[PDB]
Amino acid sequence: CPVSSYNEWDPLEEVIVGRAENACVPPFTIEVKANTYEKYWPFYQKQGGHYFPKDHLKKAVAEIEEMCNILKTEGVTVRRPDPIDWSLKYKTPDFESTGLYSAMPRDILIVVGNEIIEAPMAWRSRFFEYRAYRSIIKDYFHRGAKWTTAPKPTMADELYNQDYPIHSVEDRHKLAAQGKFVTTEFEPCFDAADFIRAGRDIFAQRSQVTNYLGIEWMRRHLAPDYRVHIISFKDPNPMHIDATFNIIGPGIVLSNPDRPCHQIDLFKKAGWTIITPPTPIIPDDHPLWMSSKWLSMNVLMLDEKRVMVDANEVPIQKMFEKLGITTIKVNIRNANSLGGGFHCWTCDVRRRGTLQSYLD
Amino acid sequence: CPVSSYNEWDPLEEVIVGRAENACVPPFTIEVKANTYEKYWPFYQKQGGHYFPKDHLKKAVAEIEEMCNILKTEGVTVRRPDPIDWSLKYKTPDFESTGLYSAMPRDILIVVGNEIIEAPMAWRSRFFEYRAYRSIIKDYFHRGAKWTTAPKPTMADELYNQDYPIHSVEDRHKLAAQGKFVTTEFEPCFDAADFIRAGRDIFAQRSQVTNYLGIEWMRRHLAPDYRVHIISFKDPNPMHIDATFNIIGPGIVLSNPDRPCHQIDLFKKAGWTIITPPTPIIPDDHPLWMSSKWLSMNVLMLDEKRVMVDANEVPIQKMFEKLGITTIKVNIRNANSLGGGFHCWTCDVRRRGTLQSYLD
């Protein structure tokens, strides 16, 4: 029973850590643009289809290797996806594209109990990302784990709001206020990272890459044992929930001050402790091609009292320390450029614990 | 400027490919025994001084001729050593012996920049192996290349640990752990194949045929432009590094799973990608008189994306293919019996590129 994980904090025993190797800049299509900050559009326009800067990838490789050494030191078993050249151009009957990477296992795999679920994805450049994780998954399957792949979308034009006001306008907030994004409800689609676990309750966010159809597929697939709840925040470009509402312990959650939750009262009434982290200190000159500066709260809990946090983010380190949480500082400043922190770069396969309810 | 090569992967333009003709079984002396698997001792004991099985040499000749046709097809200029009868018994003031062959140019010649260096060797049966390559080297010399022959050893008894526990014992590992092998530090000796190039950094291994004196001679001879680093692996019978740690691209290396590198962290910290190839599928009944089954990772790179790999080794072919490397499959199953794969059977004379650093 290699696979077994019901939440984000029980004692970690096995984890999959991503890879920065052969990462490619995704072609600049509507869904990519909806996620990209104005500042990087020229980069995407010129670099699409080519590898991310190799000198930059080399630094990320080193940072992640070190992170892996630390995990092993802390007694965690680490598995890595297979090395693949993401520059290969593939073609389905609906579209043609080059790949992205297998850096973020949290984007594609989620473990609920004894079951590993491969998310469908919503980006064309991520259609074949599952290929990097098959060796690992088959091994767990041969050893008893349940294996599920949610319905792979066609990703035909009908899935995208080709006329979304990505070009800056901010009324993204308005459509966003209406649950209206760059992805339509044409077919189910989602990234596993828009879901965050808390035992019997899983919380999901309708985002640029996760639609209501996708969430309903999860809700219907996991019921009656798990309840999937939809929550929202003040955020014009949502893509993943772990840098917005990261649950770090039974009844304790980190809420991004810039992205308040519309349903925060549900948690307050539940007696949950809402902690608002201090702002990131990451320099504005450091390239964050795929995310915001908020990767600092994208922490990974080795257990209730041990957190893997960024070596450079001192303010948030102090915060955990005043709460009695031992900080394991690792530097992943360059790996951050690919779009993720510790929670995104990993997928907890096994945590020592049982299924419980923390919402009462 | 016919000669010019700084690493193992830049676009190949000229290469020397060995010959299987008149190859002779070396006399069974201490240094030969230290390299021979128990399974072949009777062969060496009875065949020493005579030609390797002629019906077997004929198959190797054919395989190598084909390999040469492919190289020419791929636009590589191929040179071959001169045909020599290796059965001639020679006598120096220190010893008497019959020769071996000129099948492995990688064993005796290494190109660093515009300079071709003839290694000294450490086996008595290989004392006069350079004679087969003189016509080629003088031509390059007349055309501007630098030519260097490292100090030829006396190969007197003092160079060999006459009481080495070759007779099986495995504590070879222990002496090996102490950098202690069948060759003493009596005088400089080495095979060029214990060195593998990566621009400004060359890595060497102290092995059964390459001592610290030999490595220091290289380090001192190439400084300050090149840095020669010594690395070690878990290996009781080392002889050459290219089937243990074969560097295939800038920052990418194939590490033999059976022979882990003690200094792997130096490379991990450098952001290098360490790939571990799958096991060879070569039958245990096929005679490998001079090596292990690991000849499968002894690949030759025509360039960063083109590799010449064994036609029979499908698993490793698949591996390169998933990495986006075009596989040029050639069958050299019989040539393998003489002791080498593609990297051993060749010596890259000219690769299109410049001197660079890949270790940062």
Task: Please name the helix (run of DSSP H) or strand (run of DSSP E) that holds residue A269, with its range, or none.
Answer: helix A264-269
> What do you get for the CA distance between the two ends of chain A, in Å?
28
Give the range of the structural domain holding residue B92, as residue numbers without chain letter: 1-360
Q: What is the DSSP string of B113-175?
A: BTEEEE---S-GGGTTGGGGTHHHHHHHHHTT-EEEEPPPP---GGGB-TT--TTS-STHHHH
Q: How many residues does chain B have?
A: 360
Q: A84 and B269: CB-CB below 8 Å?
A: no
Tokens standing for residue A193: 């990272």
B273–chain A nearest CA distance, Å: 8
A348–chain B nearest CA distance, Å: 23
**CA–CA distance, B280 with A160 (Å, rounded to integer):** 47
Nearest Cα residue to A238 out of A205, A261, A264, A212:
A205
For the question of residue B191 being annotated catalytic, the response is yes
**Active-site annotation holder among B24, B240, B310, B348:** B240
- Residue identified by tokens 């001050």 is A257
Residue A107: C-alpha distances to residues A20, B52, B291 (Å): 14, 58, 45
Q: A84 and B273: CB-CB below 8 Å?
A: no
φ/ψ of B28, rounded to 5, equals: -80, 80
b/e map of B316-348 (b: 16 or more CB within 10 Å)?
bbebbeebebebbebbbbbbbbbbbbbbbbbbb
Sequence-distant (6+) residues with CB within 8 A of B251 are: A58, B270, B271, B272, B273, B358
Contact A109, A129 (CB under 8 A): no
For chain A, positions 56-115, list CB contacts with chain B under 8 A.
57-62, 65-66, 69, 82-85, 87-88
Residue B63: C-alpha distances to residues A29, B47, B58, B267 (Å): 50, 24, 9, 36
Q: CA nearest B275 in A: which residue? A: A83
A238–chain B nearest CA distance, Å: 32
Please state whether beta strands A346-351 and A12-17 pair in parallel, antiparallel, or not at all (unpaired). Answer: antiparallel
A65–chain B nearest CA distance, Å: 6
Mutation target to probe the A interface, by most A beta carbons within 10 A, among B322, B356, B358, B360 is B322
| Cβ–Cβ contact B260 with A under 8 A | no
Residue B214: C-alpha distances to residues A49, A139, B24, B262, B348 (Å): 47, 46, 26, 21, 22
For the question of residue B235 being annotated catalytic, the response is no
**CA–CA distance, B310 with B314 (Å, rounded to integer):** 8
Contact B190, B209 (CB under 8 A): yes
Contact A348, A111 (CB under 8 A): yes
**CA–CA distance, A226 with A358 (Å, rounded to integer):** 12
- Residue identified by tokens 């060029």 is B192
For chain B, positions 272-291, list CB contacts with chain A under 8 A.
272-273, 275
Mutation target to probe the B interface, by most B beta carbons within 10 A, among A50, A85, A88 is A85
Mutation target to probe the A interface, by most A beta carbons within 10 A, among B319, B323, B325, B326 is B323
Q: What angle do CA B58, B61, B67 make, to 5 degrees?
A: 145
Which residues of chain A does B268 touch, with a Cβ-Cβ cutoff of 8 Å? 62, 65-66, 69
Q: A57 and B271: CB-CB below 8 Å?
A: yes
Residue B252: C-alpha distances to residues B192, B233, B269, B303 (Å): 21, 18, 13, 13
**CA–CA distance, B112 with B118 (Å, rounded to integer):** 11
Longest dimension (CA), chain A: 55
Nearest Cα residue to A64 out of A6, A12, A15, A28:
A15
Alpha helices for A186-238 (secondary structure H): 212-222
Q: What angle do CA A62, A66, A68 make, to 5 degrees?
A: 115
Q: A82 and B322: CB-CB below 8 Å?
A: yes
B111: helix, strand or coil: strand
**CA–CA distance, B75 with A228 (Å, rounded to integer):** 61
B350–chain A nearest CA distance, Å: 25
**CA–CA distance, A269 with A216 (Å, rounded to integer):** 25
**Active-site annotation holder among B24, B189, B261, B344:** B344
**CA–CA distance, A247 with A244 (Å, rounded to integer):** 10
Tokens standing for residue B166: 């070759």
Which residues of chain B does A59 touch, with a Cβ-Cβ cutoff of 8 Å? 271
Residue B334: C-alpha distances to residues A260, B106, B330, B339 (Å): 70, 18, 12, 10
**CA–CA distance, B63 with B336 (Å, rounded to integer):** 10
For the question of residue A68 being annotated catalytic, the response is no
Alpha helices for B210-283 (secondary structure H): 212-222, 264-269
b/e map of B277-315 (b: 16 or more CB within 10 Å)?
beebebeeeeebbbbbbbbbbbbbbbbeebbbbbebbee
Q: A62 and B275: CB-CB below 8 Å?
A: no
**CA–CA distance, B269 with B111 (Å, rounded to integer):** 28
CB atoms inside a 10 Å sphere around CB A145 = 21
Q: B268 and A66: CB-CB below 8 Å?
A: yes
Candidate from A61, A66, A88 with C-beta closest to B273? A61
The annotation places the binding site of A for arginine at 107, 242, 259, 291-292
Q: B272 and A61: CB-CB below 8 Å?
A: yes
**CA–CA distance, B188 with B166 (Å, rounded to integer):** 22
Named by the residue before each, gaps in chain A exceeding 2.5 A from C to N are: none
**Active-site annotation holder among A10, A24, A201, A240:** A240
Mutation target to probe the B interface, by most B beta carbons within 10 A, among A17, A22, A61, A64 is A61
Contact B92, B159 (CB under 8 A): no
Residue A146: C-alpha distances to residues A195, A198, A208, A223 (Å): 19, 20, 29, 16
Burial class (CB in 10 A: 0-12, 13-18, 19+), B91: exposed
Give bridge partners of residue A245 from the DSSP assignment: A255
Q: A21 and B268: CB-CB below 8 Å?
A: no
**CA–CA distance, B101 with B244 (Å, rounded to integer):** 23
**CA–CA distance, B360 with B353 (Å, rounded to integer):** 18
Sequence-distant (6+) residues with CB within 8 A of B167 are: none
| Cβ–Cβ contact B270 with A under 8 A | yes
Write the CATH number for A339.
3.75.10.10
**CA–CA distance, A186 with A90 (Å, rounded to integer):** 23
**Ramachandran assignment for B235, one of left (phi > 0), alpha (psi -120 to 50 degrees), beta (any other):** beta
A59–chain B nearest CA distance, Å: 6
Peptide bond into A224 cis (omega under 30): yes
The annotation places the binding site of B at 107, 242, 259, 291-292
- Residue identified by tokens 């922190």 is A341
CB atoms inside a 10 Å sphere around CB A230 = 16
Alpha helices for A13-125 (secondary structure H): 30-35, 41-47, 54-73, 105-108
Residue B140: C-alpha distances to residues A234, B4, B91, B143 (Å): 71, 11, 30, 5
CB atoms inside a 10 Å sphere around CB A250 = 16
Candidate from A21, A66, A87 with C-beta closest to B273? A21
Tokens standing for residue B328: 């040029």
Q: A62 and B271: CB-CB below 8 Å?
A: yes
- Tally the domains of chain A: 1
Give strand ranges (E) for chain A. 12-17, 77-79, 89-91, 96-98, 109-112, 115-118, 146-149, 195-198, 201-204, 227-230, 245-249, 252-255, 273-275, 300-303, 306-310, 326-330, 346-351
Q: A85 and B322: CB-CB below 8 Å?
A: yes
HEC string of B35-86?
Answer: HCCHHHHHHHHHHCCCECCHHHHHHHHHHHHHHHHHHHHCCCEEECCCCCCC
Nearest Cα residue to B258 out of B274, B271, B245:
B245
Q: What is the DSSP string of A70-101?
A: HHHHTT-EEE-PPP--TT-EEE-SS-EEE---
Which residues of chain B does A334 touch, with a Cβ-Cβ cutoff of 8 Å? none
- Residue identified by tokens 């084909």 is B66
**CA–CA distance, A107 with A109 (Å, rounded to integer):** 6
- Residue identified by tokens 């800038």 is B250
Which residues of chain A does B264 touch, with a Cβ-Cβ cutoff of 8 Å? none
Burial class (CB in 10 A: 0-12, 13-18, 19+), A258: middle
Q: A85 and B275: CB-CB below 8 Å?
A: no
Which residues of chain A does B275 touch, with a Cβ-Cβ cutoff of 8 Å? 83
- How many inter-chain contacts (A to B, CB under 8 Å) are there? 36
φ/ψ of A49, rounded to 5, equals: 90, -15
- Residue identified by tokens 């071996």 is B100
| Cβ–Cβ contact B262 with A under 8 A | no
B308: helix, strand or coil: strand
Name the amino acid, one letter, at B245.
F
**Active-site annotation holder among A191, A201, A310, A348:** A191
A66–chain B nearest CA distance, Å: 7
